[model samples]
Target: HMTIQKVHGREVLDSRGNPTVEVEVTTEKGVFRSAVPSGASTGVYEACELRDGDKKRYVGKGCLQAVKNVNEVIGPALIGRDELKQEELDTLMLRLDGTPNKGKLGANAILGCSMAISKAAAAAKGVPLYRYLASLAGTKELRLPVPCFNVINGGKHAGNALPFQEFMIAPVKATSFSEALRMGSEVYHSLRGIIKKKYGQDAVNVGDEGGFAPPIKDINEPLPILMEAIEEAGHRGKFAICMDCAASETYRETYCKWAHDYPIVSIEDPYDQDDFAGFAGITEALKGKTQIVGDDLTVTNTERIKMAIEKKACNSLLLKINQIGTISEAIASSKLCMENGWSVMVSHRSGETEDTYIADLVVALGSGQIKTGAPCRGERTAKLNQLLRIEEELGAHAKFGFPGWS
Candidate 1:
């Protein structure tokens, strides 16, 4: 009954205000849609994001060619197929592209259609996306993830000396998704107040266009600022800290593991991408104590993740669907990580869209963590708001577990 009647592609604006692709799949019941996100930093091994590069339009960032690939190539092949077979559908597109990296048709094109196919199938099943995805993931237990709220920015993300890209706070101890979100919101405002007080109200702007980037960059100040804000917000020791960096090599363990009453719970990509040995060294040091997440290291690629698994490099994986280019493969990678007892965190790129696909993905896989950005910004809050709805919908079945890391 959930047969694909048509698939179409078109242009849409992402949070970056760049041209991106959105796919619409027609089924017997209705039309389902999905959009792709753009990232400022893409992995060398990750699949390609096809752009038209026409200087005349949007100053060389158009994606018309990729859109045509979806309309002419992917749309035709997907017709007359059942939308319920997500893997088969995704595989069909992969084969049609005939590229190891999904560059031929653009990974953006394939992922948009691939995501739409799932949306169609979920609609076909008359179920929520997470419930339908849970069936595919074989997740007997559903869990809402602790949102690693990026409340501050640094490094290349902002013109500051903070030496890191994202300074995040995880409301780990909350009993429900809403409570956790409230904790984050309060801390965010508290941080904003502190930023305004310390550096004048000028620092309190952007509403999270990026997160709050304070003027200081001594390499050790953001965490202290975040901690004080957490306390000022009336949630002492309720939130755990996390950070992202450009692998600029500050040797973060010295900063992250600094003796503290409130520990830095998770730190992502503190070293070079291919440095498995370096990652392994840190993972061994903080083995069971803190989370050494592999973002740049794994890039959501199976081979890289396999290498990390073998070397015992890191304890957690940062799962970004676009990095792998298909929901089926992303799910597979999540399973592989979990099989080895590693935690998975569904992530959002800095140049994200308003889509909340990963929000449901976390619930479906019971991944226990998400990193979508600060409580401000519609693009960011859209995810948290959806989580609140999902939790309210699930009620007793809704799982808000402890910290994402050990």
Candidate 2:
């Protein structure tokens, strides 16, 4: 038999300077901790923002607040119920604490509620949450977490974003080895197609036939040589290139046009994250042709996700679980993108802990896309290794359903 308890109103700061409301939900078997953003996270969030182009702006610190409210009004109602009946608790809790808007319940609500549901699901069946989630995947698929190089400059340089490493995901699917190769080819072509349309054939070059880099940047920098090497070596349409020019918004007009010329299948933060106008322009100009992506702009928050979705800012989503401060919110935002027809990519951060849980989360959530890195590093490798093991075992038919939905 297990018991349900709620802990509320703890304090913390979220990614973008907002206060987070904390909650710790305990079950007879285990405990789960969560935090909800105090900012707005409802339907009207985008327009409600104080900043013009501020994406990922609202919060729902009210999650714990709502949980506390439940404790006052609903928890008492649950007192006499059997602790073993997790489903009954969930059903009763829903009836006991209903809200006008479903999304506003905050990270607290999402995380807290999910934990409750998961605990109940597991308890009813006598299993652990990890086992339950893993069971949902049937056989785990060992998929590698491919890292997208966020090159603000050339070779191992970081600036502008707090905590240095920004994570993003790009998903690829292939039925057979040839299909896989073709799928990769398509991505590469998409990059080339976008670049050629922008800067002509001369600007889109990389190293030989499988490596790519941006065609232009803040200063001429290494863009020219890399392009020269690719062009001279005739390595176009072999490898896909991604752009991480987030800090270069001032030069996007000139640079984006030129930047598009590289074999860039995915272009992230091609301009300043704040420049929604630029994001809109780049996203529109490169949509379908290439996966125009966002990371710096949205920072993996629901508020940012709403803004990006409302504006159709990017064709792809770069989801980082920790960015918004919880696995639940990250999955929630990723679900929103998936439902709306945008491809989602789960990512890792620079300050990542050794927890490889996110890898399972992505596969479980069906956001099979990842962006760890080209070369394996500690933070990136952990995720990649976990994914590879799952993929190898799952052996096809591995699918992920978006969270917060049926």
Candidate 3:
């Protein structure tokens, strides 16, 4: 007879003193993490273990604010359901209706519901959440892809973003995904010293793959320099370029032209994620040349994905679990992408938590790519650490398949 105990919200304050919603939901089983960051496409909220028995899992960043409202809306309906029947619970959640319908449930509902269900699954299996998710997803091992750090423009720390985020890559020899890991590792090792010296040893893998900031000179310099570095890394096999432009259409068109001649393997978010037309244009221009990826645009929303597919916007999908604020919706979106011939890269957010639910999500989807960010920050490192372990466990079975984009 598990029972809901407390629903709490701690307004996350920004430097400007604006309040961002964060939530924690408690149940008899335990607390779980859920803090949706502010300004994200999906609203933020959180969830917690009630008795503090299980580790606190992330529900999202804004659960507290929505709890009372959601409870009133759904509580009357959930009164006598068996606490252990998580499937029933999830169904009930889906069935609960409100004004503005889907918008009311939003991501917070998915966050809360997924965390609770995940807890139940873990409890039933007597294993950690990752382990249970792995079992469910059939991810016994992995071969990880090297993340290309992102350096975006017009954001904080606008200048010097290239060296801060972008780096060199080694060539991969495998026809399949499993063989790419070794190739990526060899390339990473070869360039480690040179890159570390230039950027400061601590700067390695410290930024997002979609980072797009650079003075025009350095900004223009990234692709050519990266190409030369790859050749220097002794990479001669099939490889692609993965470019990320947060929201700059001009930059993307220019890069798209250059990418055709640069042995570029893939391009991701050439413009802002929402620029569907920009996405479509990039995809049309570079379709056969390389894999075109969508990140901020897709945001792991199925409806958005359908639009992307209908528009023929991109060739790949960057699946961020937190974007949807729930594993179920994440999977649903991933499935849609797969059905549409789009690849998936399970990714990490800039603002991250210790929980590596996304790592398992990648495995569950049998995804080969992960973008936890190039090797820096615990928030980023945690996902990479888990990935390394998965890779080790998978051994020969592991494949690197450029994960979604190299």
Top model by TM-score, which number? Answer: 1
Model 3 over residues 1-406: C-alpha lDDT tens digits? 4655544444443222333334444555665444443233332122211111222433333334455544555444544444345545655665563322244554444454455556555665566555566554444543355444332233333455342223323233344433444445444444444455555554444333223233434545555545544566677544454555455333456666666567666666667656788788878877766667776677566667788899999878887654555555566666678777877777765555555656655755665665654444455556656665666566665556443343
Model 3: CA > 4 A from native: 1-88, 94-113, 126-157, 160-216, 228-240, 248-256, 271-278, 393-396, 402-406
Cα error, residue 304 of model 1, in Å, equals 0.7
Candidate 2: segments with Cα more than 4 A from true spot: 2-238, 248-260, 396-406
Q: Model 3 misses residue 23 by how many Å?
A: 7.2
The TM-scores of all predictions, comma-separated, are: 0.96, 0.52, 0.68
- Residue lDDT tens for model 2, 56-162: 33333222454454345544554434544444554554444353223233333333443444544455567544455545434243233333432223322333222
The lDDT per prediction is: 0.84, 0.47, 0.53
Which one wins on lDDT? Answer: 1
Q: How many backbone collisions does model 2 have?
A: 29
Please state every model's RMSD to the true fold in angstroms.
Answer: 1.8, 11.0, 7.2
Candidate 1, which ten residues in sequence have the lowest lDDT sum?
Answer: 251-260
Model 3 error, position 57 (Å): 24
